[PDB]
Amino acid sequence: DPNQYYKIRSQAIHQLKVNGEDPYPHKFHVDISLTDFIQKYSHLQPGDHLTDITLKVAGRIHAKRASGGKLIFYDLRGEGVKLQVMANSRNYKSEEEFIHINNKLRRGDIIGVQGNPGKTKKGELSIIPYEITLLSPCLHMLPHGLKDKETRYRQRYLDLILNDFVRQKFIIRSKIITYIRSFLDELGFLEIETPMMNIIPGGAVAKPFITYHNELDMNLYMRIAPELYHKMLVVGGIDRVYEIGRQFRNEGIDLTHNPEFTTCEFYMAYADYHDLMEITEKMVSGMVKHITGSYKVTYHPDGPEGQAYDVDFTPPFRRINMVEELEKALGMKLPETNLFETEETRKILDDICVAKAVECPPPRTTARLLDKLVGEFLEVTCINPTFICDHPQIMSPLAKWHRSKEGLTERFELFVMKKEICNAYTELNDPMRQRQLFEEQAKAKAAGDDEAMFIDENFCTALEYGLPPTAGWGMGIDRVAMFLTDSNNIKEVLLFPAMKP
């Protein structure tokens, strides 16, 4: 019984303490890691037992198997690897200390082991200990944080101990971010840090978190995006900047959303969105190949017991135009794109949503109705990497008008395995038009839209100093790690995901 186990084991190590036995020693000198030990001694023959090499290793006891009173086997784990400790009475510093030490040890315990390399008749690489030291006891009975999702996510440390697939997803997450940095560093992007607390949040349509600063007596918002700060640096004459950082959205959690999440944004002066499409294909495909070995990954939309898809990251990625493809999916013609800002188009998209059973919680604005329709008809068909391009201006308040198609913008979004990955556009750099677009956002806000943008006059002022033609880009790191690890739940790729209380 777990609770009784805890009471018993807690009382025992408490006894060790008051009697001065030091169950939490300060320092154990490790000579070699378990990984290096296995690399250096795997070549031994079964039955071997080295007399001229003694080493100190450490790890956690995963299993304790008695073989008579004279012989115990410890399954010792660390670094994603394992090493057997063959504790034989005859090789220990003394037979009485052998009994004493092994009677204390339990599964879960962190230990230090001083011993000789060996291999059993079976051929299991082992260390035969002269001395075993308890470094940290485990006061709890470990799961025979095992399969129950909830326990795994609330106690990630148990998950990481018991399930090596979990450690592997977090390694690849680190490689994603590291790959992106060298990719951008090599292209001359300067890595920067902009404020995560804003008097006025910006850079996206989203509901922010609000705080208060006592000394300065002001309310602050947690950032939605670093976008506006980045463009001000480009006005400043830093032509290539990027930031990999946390963004915060005051919204609900589900399979693809956490209230804090990581993105990479970058801004490149003298680029347009066509250039970013090629950079994107290059970065994403190079990234998949680098870490997984090929351009093809397997996709299980329905878990391990469902259909398996091979997703091909070989460039170039498919491109669809948002308004055209939607009309095709609808089998019906939408208004001319120059009419996408009229109330009548709004009514038309509203009627279409009712008729097609596409829900849209209030406000039923053109932007939100459009996005719901695109989510239903286009996004779900994006298995392979696909750019959805040319977003209407009404859904894109900071993108530059498209140069040949009235009412549209130079904007794309990358979709992979039904999930949005990147959002990019050539940047709106006309201050008068940016201001008019902010004002529309402000009136939507005043009319009951929690997510609408605040007018940022200080940013419009910066645009009045001259933002060179620029293209910028934003990628959700968590989303990429999801698809590179074939995870359908974002909680798989965050170490400590946000959780219902």
Ligand X SMILES: Nc1ncnc2c1ncn2[C@@H]1O[C@H](COP(=O)(O)OP(=O)(O)OP(=O)(O)O)[C@@H](O)[C@H]1O
Ligand Y SMILES: N[C@@H](CCCC[NH3+])C(=O)O
Annotated binding site for ATP: 249-251, 257-258, 420-421, 476-479
Of Ca ion, its own copies, ligand Y, none, which one sits near residue 38, judging by CB under 5 to 8 A according to partner kind?
none
Size of the site for ligand X (CB under 6 A): 17
CB of 316 to its own copies, least distance (A): 8
Query: Is residue 373 near ligand Y by the rule CB under 6 A?
Result: no
Among the residues of 84-123, which ranges form H helices? 95-104
What are the backbone dihedrals phi and psi of residue 360, each rounded to the nearest 5 degrees, phi first?
Answer: -150, 105
Cα distance between residue 501 and residue 496, in whole Å? 14
By CB under 6 A, residue 420 contacts ligand X: yes
Tell me the longest C-alpha to C-alpha distance in the chain: 90
354 Cβ contact partners less than 8 Å away, ≥ 6 residues apart: none
CA distance linking residue 360 with residue 352, whole number of Å: 11
75 binds Ca ion (CB under 5 A): no
Q: How far is the CB of 326 from its own copies (least distance, A)?
A: 24
Peptide bond into 2 cis (omega under 30): no
**Smallest separation (angstroms) from ligand Y to the CB of 195:** 14
* CA-based nearest residue to 120, from 153, 172, 74: 74
Using CB under 6 A as the binding rule, whether residue 60 contacts ligand X is answered as no
- Beta-bridge partner residues of 86: 73
Contact 469, 272 (CB under 8 A): yes
Spatial strand order in the sheet of 218-222 = 197-198, 218-222, 210-213
Binding ligand X (rule: CB under 6 A), the pick from 287, 421, 452, 455 is: 421
- DSSP bridge pairs for 57: 113
By CB under 6 A, is residue 258 in contact with ligand X? yes
Helix axes 164-186, 477-484, angle to 10 degrees: 130
Query: Reduced to 3 DSSP states, what percent helix, strand and coil does the chain have, rounded to the nearest 5?
Result: 35, 25, 40
> Which is closer to ligand X, CB of 102 or CB of 258?
258
Task: Write the CA distances from 242 to 181, 474, 478, integer angstroms.
Answer: 9, 10, 17
* One character per residue 234-273, x = contact with ligand Y (rule: CB under 6 A): -------------------------------x--------
Exactly one of 239, 275, 420, 430 binds Ca ion (CB under 5 A); that residue is 420
Nearer to ligand Y, 345 or 470 (CB): 470
Verify binding: residue 423, Ca ion, rule CB under 5 A: yes
To the nearest whole angstrom, how small is the minimum distance from the Cβ of residue 492 to ligand X? 13
Q: Which partner from the list ligand Y, its own copies, Ca ion, none does 123 bind, CB cut-off 5 to 8 Å by kind?
A: none
CB nearer to ligand X: give 386 or 423.
423
What is the DSSP code (8-state) at residue 202?
-
Closest residue to ligand X using C-beta atoms: 476
Which stretches of the chain bind ligand X, using CB under 6 A? 204-206, 249, 256-258, 261, 263, 420-423, 474, 476, 478-479
Which stretches of the chain bind ligand Y, using CB under 6 A? 203-204, 225, 227, 265, 423-425, 427, 472-474
